[PDB]
Each structure stands twice: as C-alpha cells, then as structure tokens.
Design an enzyme around this catalytic site. Structure first.
Site, mmCIF file in Angstrom:
data_model
loop_
_atom_site.group_PDB
_atom_site.id
_atom_site.type_symbol
_atom_site.label_atom_id
_atom_site.label_comp_id
_atom_site.label_asym_id
_atom_site.label_seq_id
_atom_site.Cartn_x
_atom_site.Cartn_y
_atom_site.Cartn_z
ATOM 1 N N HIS A 192 25.646 15.445 -0.444
ATOM 2 C CA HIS A 192 26.640 16.448 -0.109
ATOM 3 C C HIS A 192 26.091 17.182 1.103
ATOM 4 O O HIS A 192 24.967 17.667 1.071
ATOM 5 C CB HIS A 192 26.881 17.410 -1.273
ATOM 6 C CG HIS A 192 27.710 18.595 -0.896
ATOM 7 N ND1 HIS A 192 29.043 18.495 -0.558
ATOM 8 C CD2 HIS A 192 27.391 19.904 -0.786
ATOM 9 C CE1 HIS A 192 29.504 19.690 -0.236
ATOM 10 N NE2 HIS A 192 28.518 20.559 -0.363
ATOM 11 N N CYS B 278 30.637 23.367 -4.903
ATOM 12 C CA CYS B 278 30.518 22.102 -4.189
ATOM 13 C C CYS B 278 29.779 20.982 -4.938
ATOM 14 O O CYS B 278 30.022 19.801 -4.685
ATOM 15 C CB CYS B 278 29.930 22.346 -2.792
ATOM 16 S SG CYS B 278 30.924 23.544 -1.877
ATOM 17 N N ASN C 53 33.395 20.200 5.623
ATOM 18 C CA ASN C 53 32.953 20.310 4.246
ATOM 19 C C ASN C 53 34.173 20.415 3.314
ATOM 20 O O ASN C 53 34.874 21.423 3.311
ATOM 21 C CB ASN C 53 32.037 21.530 4.106
ATOM 22 C CG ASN C 53 31.567 21.766 2.668
ATOM 23 O OD1 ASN C 53 32.148 21.249 1.694
ATOM 24 N ND2 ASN C 53 30.523 22.566 2.533
ATOM 25 N N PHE D 274 35.265 24.409 6.530
ATOM 26 C CA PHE D 274 35.855 23.802 5.317
ATOM 27 C C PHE D 274 37.099 22.967 5.622
ATOM 28 O O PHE D 274 38.001 23.410 6.335
ATOM 29 C CB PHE D 274 36.232 24.882 4.292
ATOM 30 C CG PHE D 274 35.052 25.539 3.610
ATOM 31 C CD1 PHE D 274 34.109 24.784 2.920
ATOM 32 C CD2 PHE D 274 34.904 26.912 3.636
ATOM 33 C CE1 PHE D 274 33.023 25.394 2.266
ATOM 34 C CE2 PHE D 274 33.798 27.543 2.987
ATOM 35 C CZ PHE D 274 32.868 26.770 2.301
#
Lengths: 389, 389
Positions: free
Chosen positions: A301, A162, A334, A213
């Site tokens: 993030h 990530c 995400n 996700f």
C-alpha cells in the site's frame, strides 16, 4: 461426531487469490490542471496566492492522475460540498450510499469474469469501504446488483482506513480455509465524496487531502483447493497478521463529523511507518529463513510518495521492489483500501508481460503490506505461482 | 510445504463459547414513567395527545425497563439531541466515540474473568457496534482499555443492525477453528445516543423507536480445543449461516444522517420475519435429522414482542422456547446487536437453576437466531453442554 463433522466440512489446502479486478470512476483528473478545477468550483478564484500554494502541494504529491466520481456538474447541484466545514453530510450520504456499491460492482464483475465461474459458486462476500453507511448496508446493495445467491454470507466492514484492504485477505484466509468449497468474493471500494471540501488558509492537512486521494475499487476471488484445470491461483496466502504500534494514535487518523470526513497526520508518518516494520517482517519472514529484504517481492500500500521512499530506504530495497506501488500511486493516487488490489494486479500483470517465472516477478515469497490508523500494520505473506508461458 | 504447514497451524475441533459477560449503563429507565421523562426533557409537555399515544405505545411494547447512557443532564448540556430533526450529529459523535468502547470494556472484563485465563492468551478481538465511528476506531480503544497485547488481531464491525450479534459467532467460528490455539474475544456494544430524538406529531415511526430500544453490551470468549480441566465450554458452535430474504429491504432498516440515525419499519415486519424463517431453519436443522421445531432450544434475538409472538405462533413453539428472549426484552429492551448475548446468558443460567441436563434447557441442539435489515437472517446451530449437578 462433531470432530468427524469438522473433518468433513473444512478445506484442505491454503487460501489462494484466484482473480483480480479493478475499476475507477470515468472522470479523469490531471494533476497539472487540478488547481484550476479545484479553485474554480470552490468559488476561491479570488485567492490567487492560496491557489499557488496548492499547485506546489499537488506537484509535491508526485501524482499525475486520479479518477473521481465528483464532477463540476454534481458540485453545482450540491454546493455545500464546496465549503470548508459547513454541515454537508446529507449531500454526501446521498451520493456514497448510492455509488459505493455501484463502483464496487464494476471491480467485482471483472474479478468474477477472470475467475470464469458461476456466481452461484460464491459462498461469502467480504466488502470494505470508508463510506456508504445505510441499513441495509452497502454489502446488501452490492450482492443485489451482482445477482449473488440470497444464501451468500455477507460481511460489511465500514470506515476502517487504508490498511483494511490487506486486512480483508486476513479475514478471507480463515473463511476459505475453514470451509470446503468456500469461494470468497473480496471487494474494497472507496469514493472521496465525504472528504472533498473547499480550502482554508489555516488547514494544511485538509487541503493536502484534496491533492493525494483518488477513487477506486478492487476485488479478488479467494478460495482453497483450486478446481483442477479451471481455477488457476495467482498467489497462495501463506500467513496473515496484524500489529499495532504502541502510542501512535496521533501518527494518522480521521474524524467523522457533520462536515464529512477529515484526516490528520504527522509530517514524520513516513518515518514512523518505516521504523516500525521490523517486528512484522520478522514474524512473517523468519520462519521461511529469508536472509535479505530484496530476496522477496513486495505488494505495498503506497500511502504516499514519502512513505514509499521511507520504506525503500529503511529496508534498502532496490527500485524494482516498490515500483508497482509507485506506478499505481502516480496513475491513480491513494485510493485507500482499494490501492493494494491495484498494486497486486500490476505486479502479476507486469510479471506476465515481462516473461517472469512467477507471478511475484520471478521470486517465490512475497509480503503484501497495509498500514493505517492505529498505527495498524497488516502483513500478508504471499507465495507466488509459476507462470507457464 | 504448504499443506503440512496448514495441517499443523489449524485447530482440531469445533469453536466453543467458553464464557459470557454482559453490562448496561447504570441509569434505570422504568417504562411506567418513561413517557413523563421523555416528553418533559424534550420540551414537549404541550403535546399531550402525542404523549397519550406514546404511553399507549410504551404499554404495548411490554418493556418494563431499560438502561441508557443518556440522562437529563446530557440532554440539557446538548439540547440539539432533543430536536426532532436538526443537525445534531457532532454532539452524538462526541459521546459515542468515547462511550461505546467504555461500555464494551465492562462486558469484556466479565467474560474474560469467567474464562479465567490470562489476557495475553487472547489472539483475536472481534467487536461490533452501530456507533462510535472514528479513526483509529472503537476496537483500538477497547483493546487499549482492556490492555490487550499489541499483536491481537483486531476487527471492527460498524453500523450493522441487530442481527450482527449473531453474525459475530459466524465470524468467530472460522477464526477459532482455523487457527490452533486461537482465543477470540467477541464483543457487541450498543448505545442509543445516536438515535435518541424528540417527538414529532406526524412521525409515529420514529416515536415507536423511542419506546423499545435500550443500551447494553455482551461479550464471549470463543476458542477451539478447550484446555482439559481449565476451559469449560458452555456451548459448541456446530454451524453458522446467513441468508437474505428477497424483496424485503423496506421491511426494516435505517438511515445515517446529519440528525443521526433513524429507523424505519413496516407494520407487518413480525409476519415478514416469521414467514421467512422456515427455509433457513430447514437448511440448518435437517442435517441433524430434527423433525419438529420444539425438538431444539432457542436463543432468539427478540426484536420486539410482536416479533417474538409471530415466530412462536408460526413455528408452533410452546411458550418455553422464547421465554428467555421475552424475559431479556422485558427487563432490558432491544439492545440491538448485544441482546442475543443476554438471552444466551439467561438460557445457560436458567438451565442450571432449574436442574436441566444441558446448558440448552435439557436439549442437545439449538438455534441462536439473529435478524435485522435486509432482511438478514443469521442462524447459528449450537450444541449444548452437559450440566453436572
């Protein structure tokens, strides 16, 4: 001679972010009905009790919506995607090799459209994704779909997790700054086709991955020495650094196997991240003489809802600082390496609409953050740019 | 100040190759007996006609020997590696994830040892391989095996083809020139555990892949502004660029599947490569005013013997130019991204043994050349360094 040559060929000013574009697959997945879709397509409609467990996981994530390339139609065509750990890699490769560059192309066009300059002026392409491994690679396919010059310098970065989103700004910094006229097209693209799988009663981690996700792509144009009156920097990249946190391989990570990707994590990952930011932020902000964590802006993030809460709590930031990270994570999930580009775009967009003095919500200095497997911490110091309304 | 800070943080002079190390697995495979070993361990002693073919292939490759991690034992313990095309990806992953960093470490230590300086002065790690995908990845493992400080800027380049060894110098150039004091460890490591497979009587293409590829790793330290009387450059990187040949994606490439990696090529790949070099080399060498191809030295990724021949013939190079590529290819095979570093090490050593005036066989200017799937051509212009006998 070569020192003269050096002086001639290098850029003068710092790297800047000149444009941002983002894109998702067209298929909307509401979290409230996701357990219904997920249990139906995975032929698990006869385990109502595991389905209830999943509805509670979905609610806990705090995600409202995600966008996925995957559809019931594709799953019907490719049933092995719907099993827990059956060999399914070929079906997954079929898709990601094709689509990784297609989704990336949408985000890249948008970035290029905002920049408003010819593709012939792009000198480098830096492209990251977990997925889409082939030879020639995803970068070649992306370059080709965009119609980039055959002389663009390409770099593909596969299968970093990530934090690679932030890491690409660290790379682009050196490419833009060391080469006069260099214009760097930076793209992150993620499609969760390799990690989608059916449920197993003894695998919380894998079922949790089904819930948080999403798919997405982000793109920036990076360059030093903006063209007067044409290129309008959104941010200056002041510094970029990486730090690895000792003995934390176990915090988070993943494996690539015949079933696709699977990701692991400790429940204390939110704390492990928050507790290990001190060093990075000190290296980053102490040269500027920053007194207080609320004194700068934050492009984080998100990781997950718990991670945001942990970082906000540890740095004692007021709610506004990470609200962009909360917004993107809520509305998109995400999206791995892409997520930070969505967050950056939100910061500068809210800044314009809400009438702020700068692209960093009225503030001068900011930190863009990525974190992933390592544990790896990516810190980018950004300088905001004045907004002339 | 954004510009003043920039002027102080960057290096002054060109990136420099300060040291070179190479390593191979300890298992010698003699080409003369490789057909006997290959057909026996894959249980194909009843394919005598294909064996007869393969021996002819092996003879034509002009390879004398290779070094492979793989052994008869590994193959007996994991028989799926021997099948032509059954799912065998997990077996391969199990080996490459641990072994890729391990071999890389050997090459890395040798380069660091020649450099002669403390590990703590390494600021960047740039590491490429086709193999060894995991999260955290190979760079983390390598950095850990080396005992690199936790603040080293790591970059992992996975699954790029043979030209990637060249392209890491292109990357290293900008990292080293743009950061005052930066010392970059550049490492390429390849291990063919993921593409090794048994023979199919209807697939000469895959079979050709078993004749020419070997295992190895190369490493360099790259930095700008070398310490007077401490660091001695072997070469200067004057320039580095990539281009793509239009409509040649089918010339050479490969796919990552449940059976691992397989590679494809057209029979005319040598001519395809040879015929599409002039443009790149012109762009690289014209600014230096070089009039003839024999005016410069050559560090060529060999590809195979047919490819060396075609470049030589097309460029009308005398035999000495690609001499080093030939010797490395013959004594080690194509080690993909690592090969060019063996070739480099071979040129600079021979230059010293034969009493040449420079580390580039007595000439001032060279091209280090990589090529692979795209077609991708990586050109790195080098300036040689005086040798003092």
């Amino acid at each position: 001679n070569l020192h003269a040559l050096r002086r001639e060929q290098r850029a003068q000013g710092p790297a800047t972010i000149m444009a941002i574009g983002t894109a998702t697959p067209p298929n909307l997945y509401e979290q409230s009905t996701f357990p219904d879709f997920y249990f139906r397509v995975t032929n698990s409609d006869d385990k109502q009790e595991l389905k209830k467990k999943f509805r509670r996981m979905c609610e806990k994530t705090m995600v409202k919506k995600r966008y996925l390339h995957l559809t019931e139609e594709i799953l019907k065509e490719r049933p092995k995607l719907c099993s827990y750990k059956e060999a399914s890699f070929d079906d997954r490769q079929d898709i990601v090799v094709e689509e990784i560059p297609r989704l990336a192309k949408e985000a890249a066009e948008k970035a290029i459209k905002e920049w408003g300059r010819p593709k012939s002026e792009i000198t480098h392409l830096v492209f990251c994704s977990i997925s889409g491994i082939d030879m020639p690679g995803a970068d070649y396919r992306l370059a080709t779909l965009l119609g980039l010059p055959l002389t663009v310098n390409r770099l593909m970065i596969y299968s970093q997790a990530c934090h690679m989103g932030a890491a690409m700004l660290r790379i682009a910094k050196d490419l833009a700054e060391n080469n006069r006229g260099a214009r760097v097209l930076v793209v992150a693209c993620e499609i969760t086709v390799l990690s989608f799988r059916g449920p197993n009663e003894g695998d919380f981690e894998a079922l949790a991955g089904q819930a948080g996700f999403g798919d997405g792509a982000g793109a920036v144009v990076v360059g030093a020495d903006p063209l007067e009156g044409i290129e309008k920097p959104i941010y200056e990249i002041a510094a970029a650094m990486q730090e690895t946190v000792a003995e934390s391989q176990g915090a988070v990570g993943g494996h690539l196997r015949a079933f696709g990707w699977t990701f692991y994590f400790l429940n204390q990952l939110p704390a492990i991240i928050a507790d290990n930011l001190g060093r990075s932020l000190e290296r980053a902000l102490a040269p500027l003489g920053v007194r207080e964590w609320n004194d700068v802006f934050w492009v984080a993030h998100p990781g997950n809802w718990a991670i945001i809460d942990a970082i906000e709590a540890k740095l004692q930031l007021s709610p506004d600082k990470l609200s962009t990270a909360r917004h993107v994570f809520t509305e998109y999930g995400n999206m791995q390496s892409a997520t930070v580009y969505f967050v950056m775009d939100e910061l500068r967009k809210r800044s314009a609409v809400e009438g702020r003095s700068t692209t960093g919500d009225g503030l001068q200095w900011g930190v863009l953050l990525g974190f992933g497997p390592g544990l790896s911490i990516e810190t980018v110091v950004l300088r905001s740019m004045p907004l002339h309304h």
